[PDB]
Amino acid sequence: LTADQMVSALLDAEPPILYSEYEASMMGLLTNLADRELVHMINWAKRVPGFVDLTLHDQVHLLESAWLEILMIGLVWRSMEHPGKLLFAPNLLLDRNQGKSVEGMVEIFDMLLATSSRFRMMNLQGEEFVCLKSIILLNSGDHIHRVLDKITDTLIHLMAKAGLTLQQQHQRLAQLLLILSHIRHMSNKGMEHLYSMKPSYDLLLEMLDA
Amino acid sequence: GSHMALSLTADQMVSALLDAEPPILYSEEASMMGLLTNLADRELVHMINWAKRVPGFVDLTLHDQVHLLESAWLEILMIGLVWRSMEHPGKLLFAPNLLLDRNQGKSVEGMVEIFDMLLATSSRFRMMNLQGEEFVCLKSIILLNSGVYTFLEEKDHIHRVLDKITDTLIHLMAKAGLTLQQQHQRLAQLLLILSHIRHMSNKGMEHLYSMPSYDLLLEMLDAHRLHAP
Ligand SMILES: CC(C)(F)CN1[C@@H]2CCC[C@@]1(c1c(F)cc(/C=C/C(=O)O)cc1F)c1[nH]c3ccccc3c1C2
Numbered sequence: 001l002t003a004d005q006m007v008s009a010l011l012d013a014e015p016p017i018l019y020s021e022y023e024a025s026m027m028g029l030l031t032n033l034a035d036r037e038l039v040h041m042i043n044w045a046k047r048v049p050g051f052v053d054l055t056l057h058d059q060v061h062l063l064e065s066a067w068l069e070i071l072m073i074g075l076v077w078r079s080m081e082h083p084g085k086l087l088f089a090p091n092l093l094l095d096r097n098q099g100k101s102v103e104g105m106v107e108i109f110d111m112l113l114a115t116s117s118r119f120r121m122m123n124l125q126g127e128e129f130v131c132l133k134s135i136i137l138l139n140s141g142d143h144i145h146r147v148l149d150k151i152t153d154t155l156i157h158l159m160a161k162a163g164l165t166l167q168q169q170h171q172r173l174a175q176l177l178l179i180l181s182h183i184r185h186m187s188n189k190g191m192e193h194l195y196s197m198k199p200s201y202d203l204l205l206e207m208l209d210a
Numbered sequence: 211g212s213h214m215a216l217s218l219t220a221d222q223m224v225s226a227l228l229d230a231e232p233p234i235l236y237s238e239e240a241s242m243m244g245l246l247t248n249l250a251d252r253e254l255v256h257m258i259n260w261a262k263r264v265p266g267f268v269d270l271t272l273h274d275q276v277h278l279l280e281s282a283w284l285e286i287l288m289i290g291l292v293w294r295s296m297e298h299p300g301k302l303l304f305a306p307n308l309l310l311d312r313n314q315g316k317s318v319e320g321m322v323e324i325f326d327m328l329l330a331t332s333s334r335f336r337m338m339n340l341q342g343e344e345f346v347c348l349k350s351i352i353l354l355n356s357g358v359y360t361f362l363e364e365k366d367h368i369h370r371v372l373d374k375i376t377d378t379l380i381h382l383m384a385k386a387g388l389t390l391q392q393q394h395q396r397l398a399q400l401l402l403i404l405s406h407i408r409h410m411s412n413k414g415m416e417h418l419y420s421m422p423s424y425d426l427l428l429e430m431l432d433a434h435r436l437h438a439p
Binding site: 118139149152156174179181182 | 356369372376380391393395401402404405407408409412413416
């Protein structure tokens with residue numbers, strides 16, 4: 001794949017924006033939405049170049065490690081145009097105060113809002129976003145490393161076509177990748193919260209093995 | 211005289227970071243945990259001295275300095291550990307007199323998973339032939355990045371300093387003989403390892419709460435004003 005073919009393949013693989021159903025009410029709605037987004041995520045993963053070249057075991061491990069980071073990056077991306085709010089769905093736009101209804105949720109909401117504001121301030125583009133989402137999938141858990149190098153080349157190509165100087169290109173690449181450390185942190189805090197009040201192997205395996 | 215962070219050339223940045231480097235300390239299942247806790251506490255004191263010398267860090271308010279150190283202290287201890295453990299495959303060089311293999315971690319409940327992650331990180335840095343000058347840049351990035359979007363002109367300042375550190379990393383790779391494409395690929399590889407260091411710190415923090423607060427760090431950062439030069 002050329003950088004242009006990589007971009008086209010990632011944009012074409014994009015999952016759809018889902019709608020919510022119709023504290024306890026909010027948690028139920030958010031859980032149901034996450035479960036429905038997960039099914040589309042498996043189908044998206046299968047279309048990421050290089051992902052199907054991996055063994056079923058490697059595919060399962062990468063998705064098991066990255067699913068929350070991928071849900072979170074998708075959330076923060078569609079929430080960019082809504083300062084102070086999280087656009088879980090077009091019919092479920094929640095502010096900080098609504099996160100205070102559930103114990104331990106306000107901290108995660110605050111981190112997601114801060115990430116959305118950073119992407120807004122950076123003017124993150126759709127083509128950069130799909131590259132970042134693919135990196136999260138391949139990195140969160142030699143061929144994988146060669147594919148990651150190809151995504152970096154693709155990110156640079158996008159910035160060069162956008163008219164950034166050679167210096168601006170490395171500075172922007174670094175700024176984008178550093179936010180991935182923040183997304184990892186949020187996923188770890190989210191996973192901790194899930195185990196405090198407790199998406200299965202069968203779900204991933206049935207969809208990954210036809 | 212005093213160089214402002216944004217005025218530094220790549221060479222001045224490297225010299226400032228190398229000069230700020232903390233020393234390698236010596237060590238003093240219950241005995242093992244005590245030794246590692248005591249070592250971490252002693253490394254923390256040197257870490258405050260190091261942080262104060264990281265260009266741009268003293269331009270921040272005392273409250274912002276504490277917020278950054280509170281978020282980054284374990285990532286900084288971990289990156290230091292993985293760096294000095296590079297020349298020792300299968301072992302973690304906590305101190306020259308405390309070199310531990312993964313089997314030793316098995317003596318403490320939940321410790322093996324963290325040791326395995328630290329060992330994997332050390333092997334990745336060895337395979338990439340991480341240089342001392344790149345390492346100091348990475349440690350500085352961890353400090354300035356780990357708490358920025360966890361708290362306009364002051365936030366922009368941190369981001370401008372981070373850009374200066376990236377420019378420094380690129381300069382080092384360019385002088386090492388890497389093509390422009392190879393520089394971008396190496397930079398990306400290194401920054402992706404930072405997401406793994408964040409992961410390890412989160413898992414490490416979780417283990418601590420199962421078994422350095424804002425107040426403790428605030429007092430240590432403030433007490434630095436009283437130390438002799
Ligand atoms: C997982 C955790 C603790 F970080 C909270 N999450 C973040 C905040 C909103 C609730 C949600 C969440 C979840 F991601 C998963 C579950 C799962 C339950 C079960 O399996 O029983 C329950 C949640 F509340 C969730 N929902 C989403 C939908 C679209 C896009 C993003 C999200 C997120 C991010």
